[PDB]
Nucleic acid binder design. Structure first.
Ligand SMILES: Nc1ncnc2c1ncn2[C@@H]1O[C@H](CSCC[C@H](N)C(=O)O)[C@@H](O)[C@H]1O
Ligand SMILES: [Zn+2]
Ligand SMILES: [Zn+2]
Ligand SMILES: [Zn+2]
Ligand SMILES: [Zn+2]
Length: 869
DNA sequence: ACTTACGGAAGG
DNA sequence: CCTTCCGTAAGT
């Protein structure tokens, strides 16, 4: 069975009543009733201090009875402000100024606090915690109800060792409401409202301004540089532009008885289709920044314009989008075509280098930093040719990381190639995943052990495990990464209310107890997207509450993995936490353009929408990775492949394949092995057409001679489906007595050995017609979310090869996840598929790791600048 | 060990 | 109304 969650007392007292039967024991507060705010109307609410009462009586609100219970004024001090309607609680403010405004009366400047019940924490927060917000306004002194004592609960100097342990308002963190960020209080140097200073610094970062005038002309004036959103651009720099900023000179009835299920295809929406993905950014080289002169004879310093030399992508030339198949993802062509755009349109700065002018090689230059492009040739669109460009065209220590619920190590691998971490410890109960981690991380300690048992060992002074493996003590772990089991949070689990999924979900508590005990600098929790909305977003709320209770800067978000370099839709919830002395990391900007339907990443918690700090919504520097970029070089293999190590009959064909294979010649291809489906499943896969969007619904209703001694029989429609109606020939469409609403199934309408699987028309009407089951991938599209078992009749069943009559291999699944072709998997084909489908795609972990590297560099620079004072 | 039959909430 | 998609019990 499953063990109970090991807890510190801090985490226990928060997750107490939620996992009442799952955490090891030694007003529930979490029900839907205990989560709504106080009413404000009743004589109970108007007697607690939040609404301007006495408070001598407790008298809980008369809507929050849990169904699980038994039954002078001087600047610098904080005050209460009563709003119009009394049902909203007292607004807590700080006095930043106390001027006497003539003609208006006594006045002051209120810098607002945010109560904990007004944040993403909701009712989970304690009624005394406050949060700093950039919210101020001038109010009359007629509004002060009373003077409030507010304390600044700072983290101690031994905060990193406080894992394991009145009635005045306190605060520790600043709150950003748009992104639900909890950060340290901003160090702002001196009225002096802090919110006013921060908003004034923000408003003078929004405004683009030209700098260092270059040459004065009659109708305009050139400038050498400009600045926008804190980014400085000069003449000759590369700029990102929206795909609409300029243009290129290159001119851009079935047989319903043969196919009785084809009628269920009436949406025309194709899973994994890239026909609606946007174009990547336009790339320009700034030839001149200029401002037009007003009628007064001097420049308009707000109408900043830039002239730009256009760059072509290989898919922008006359040739075709096939030109993008083998080309580099950051390869361009120089053009002598120019375009004038506005400075407000620029989406960022890039680097466009002439290829054979570089001191490095273009392969080492391309991996050096972000936004790096190169070109070798100039494109002539009027003659549709390529020449060489003209002359005016040329010219920290690693964190010590503990990975809990490691698996095969996709998150650790992504963090390792980001250069930020050194995974020294891994906890992985499942033995094949632990062996894969040992094969991919020869210098780590993998604990093949339950995380609860190991945490209970380390919270006592045991210092070593049974096999004699040195456990990590507090002080060893600078980074704690992990993805706890998602099986109880997934939207595919239809038994998520049973003890199995309860004990799956209780491992988030174990992970948070690791975070509490070890107090690392950085903490990463990864889960499926449904982690943020499971059980009314209460697990997310309680996790963020635990984090802010420890004293952590924390933030949550959702990231689409395909926006970072994989041909796969995979939306994942990410929780980032930083110790009080750190910078809270930002989530990474999308690198590749991805299908807009796969990019819904906002999170609604308690009827409030939270986004991430991401700004790249539509476009991006790079083009989408496709199925052909992923597996167009893997040789032909058959259903039920068993040969582990085979040959690469050829070289890589796309940029993605060169990235995943490398440059050193390795003619060994491992794990291009497919599941061995039965004869009926094989005949079904044989009869799925090759056209895109093909799935079980264009199966033929014929009898087929299987490979074994069996004839797959014909599906019979024995009942009338009053919702689907009848076919053109008058044939029925129901397969069980369930089709008549208000009737039970019949244990005689179940039909076996059919080419069309009976269960799919049986329950298709309430399951989106099982769209995608026995579905093929298209070469121009992307994968669907790679799960631990590619099953053509699974909930995610779009796993058929584009051309071959089989299921995607282990190599193709690892490539849809962004795993290097040298990454080691272990066990039988099911173990390998499970390792691959459980992992975090290494490109996503690499983007997040670079965002953590930013904060590590920032802290190091701040230490240096405070050391040479 | 293998194969199938398949609930319901959230977000657009 | 349609689409999502780290999968689970139960049968065999
Ligand atoms: N109680 C527990 N103790 C230790 N490991 C556990 C566990 N429960 C589940 N696991 C492991 O957690 C793993 C899933 S997380 C593994 C994938 C990881 N996100 C990655 O990027 O590679 C599974 O392999 C499972 O064996
Ligand atoms: Zn009340
Ligand atoms: Zn309750
Ligand atoms: Zn102010
Ligand atoms: Zn039925």
């Amino acid at each position: 069975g499953p063990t109970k969650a090991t807890t510190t007392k801090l985490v226990y007292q928060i997750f107490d009543t939620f996992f009442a039967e799952q955490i090891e024991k030694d007003r529930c507060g979490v029900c839907e009733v205990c989560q709504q705010p106080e009413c404000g109307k009743c004589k109970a609410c108007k007697d607690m201090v939040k609404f301007g009462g006495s408070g001598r009586s407790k008298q809980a609100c008369q809507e929050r009875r849990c169904p699980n219970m038994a039954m002078t004024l001087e600047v610098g001090d904080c005050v209460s402000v009563i709003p119009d309607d009394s049902s909203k609680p007292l607004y807590l403010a700080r006095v930043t100024a106390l001027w006497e405004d003539s003609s208006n009366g006594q006045m002051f400047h209120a810098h607002w606090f945010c109560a904990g019940t007004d944040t993403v924490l909701g009712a989970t927060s304690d009624p005394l915690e406050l949060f700093l917000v950039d919210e101020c306004e001038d109010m009359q002194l007629s509004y002060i109800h009373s003077k409030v004592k507010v304390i600044y609960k700072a983290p101690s100097e031994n905060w990193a060792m406080e894992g394991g342990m009145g009635k005045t308002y306190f605060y520790q963190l600043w709150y950003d409401q748009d992104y639900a960020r909890f950060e340290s209080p901003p160090k702002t140097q001196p009225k002096f409202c802090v919110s006013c200073a921060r908003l004034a610094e923000m408003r003078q970062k929004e405004i683009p301004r030209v700098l260092e005038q270059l040459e004065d002309l009659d109708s305009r004036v050139l400038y050498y540089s400009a600045t926008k959103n804190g980014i400085l651009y000069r003449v000759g720099d590369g700029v990102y532009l929206p795909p609409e900023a300029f243009t290129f000179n290159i001119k851009l009835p079935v047989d319903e008885d043969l196919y009785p299920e084809h009628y269920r295809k009436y949406s025309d929406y194709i899973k994994g289709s890239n026909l609606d993905a946007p174009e990547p950014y336009r790339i320009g080289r700034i030839k001149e920044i200029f401002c037009p002169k007003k009628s007064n004879g001097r420049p308009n310093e707000t109408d900043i314009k830039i002239r730009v030399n256009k760059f072509y992508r290989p898919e922008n030339t006359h040739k075709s989008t096939p030109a993008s198949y083998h080309a580099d993802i950051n390869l361009l062509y120089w053009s002598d075509e120019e375009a004038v755009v506005d400075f407000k349109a620029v989406q960022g700065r890039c680097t466009v280098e002439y290829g054979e002018d570089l001191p490095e090689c273009v392969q080492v230059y391309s991996m050096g930093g972000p936004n790096r492009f190169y070109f070798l040739e100039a494109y002539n669109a009027k003659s549709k040719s390529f020449e060489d460009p003209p002359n005016h065209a040329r010219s920290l220590p690693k964190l010590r990381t503990l990975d809990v619920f490691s698996g095969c190590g996709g998150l650790s691998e992504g963090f390792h190639q980001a250069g930020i971490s050194d995974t020294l410890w891994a906890i992985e109960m499942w033995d094949p995943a632990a062996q894969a981690f040992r094969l991919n991380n020869p210098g780590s300690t993998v604990f093949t052990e339950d995380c609860n048992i190991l945490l209970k060992l380390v919270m006592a002074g045991e210092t070593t495990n049974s096999r004699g493996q040195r456990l990590p003590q507090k002080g060893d772990v600078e980074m704690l990464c992990g993805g706890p089991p998602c099986q109880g949070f997934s939207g595919m689990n239809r038994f998520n209310s049973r003890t199995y999924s309860k004990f799956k979900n209780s491992l988030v508590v174990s992970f948070l107890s690791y975070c509490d005990y070890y107090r690392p600098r950085f903490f990463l929790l990864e889960n499926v997207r449904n982690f943020v909305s499971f059980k009314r977003s209460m697990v997310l709320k309680l996790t963020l509450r635990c984090l802010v209770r420890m004293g952590y800067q924390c933030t949550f978000g959702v990231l689409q993995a395909g926006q970072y370099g994989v041909a796969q839709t995979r939306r994942r919830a990410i929780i980032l936490a930083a110790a009080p002395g750190e910078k809270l990391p930002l989530f990474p900007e999308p690198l590749h353009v991805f299908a807009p339907r796969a990019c819904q990443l906002s999170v609604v918690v308690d009827d409030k929408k939270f986004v991430s700090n991401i700004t790249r919504l539509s476009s991006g520097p790079f083009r989408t990775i496709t199925v052909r970029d992923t597996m167009s070089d893997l040789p032909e293999v058959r259903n039920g492949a068993s040969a582990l190590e085979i040959s690469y009959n050829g070289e890589p064909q796309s940029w993605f394949q060169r990235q995943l294979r490398g440059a050193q010649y390795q003619p060994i291809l491992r794990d291009h092995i497919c599941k061995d489906m039965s004869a009926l499943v094989a005949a079904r896969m044989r009869h799925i057409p090759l056209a895109p969007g093909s799935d079980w619904r264009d199966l033929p209703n014929i009898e087929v001679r299987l490979s074994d001694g069996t004839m797959a029989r014909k599906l019979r429609y024995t009942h009338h489906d009053r919702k689907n109606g009848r076919s053109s020939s008058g044939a029925l469409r129901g397969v069980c007595s369930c089709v008549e609403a208000g009737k039970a199934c019949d244990p005689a309408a179940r039909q076996f050995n059919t080419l069309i699987p009976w269960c799919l028309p049986h329950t298709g009407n309430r399951h989106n017609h099982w769209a995608g089951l026995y579905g093929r991938l298209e070469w121009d599209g992307f994968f669907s979310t790679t799960v631990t078992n590619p099953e053509p009749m699974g909930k995610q069943g779009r796993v058929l090869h584009p051309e071959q009559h089989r299921v995607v291999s282990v190599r193709e699944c690892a490539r849809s996840q962004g795993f290097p072709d040298t990454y080691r998997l272990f066990g039988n084909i099911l173990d390998k598929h499970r390792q691959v489908g459980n992992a975090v795609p290494p490109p996503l972990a690499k983007a997040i790791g670079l965002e953590i590297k930013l904060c590590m560099l920032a802290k190091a620079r701040e230490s240096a600048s405070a050391k040479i004072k």
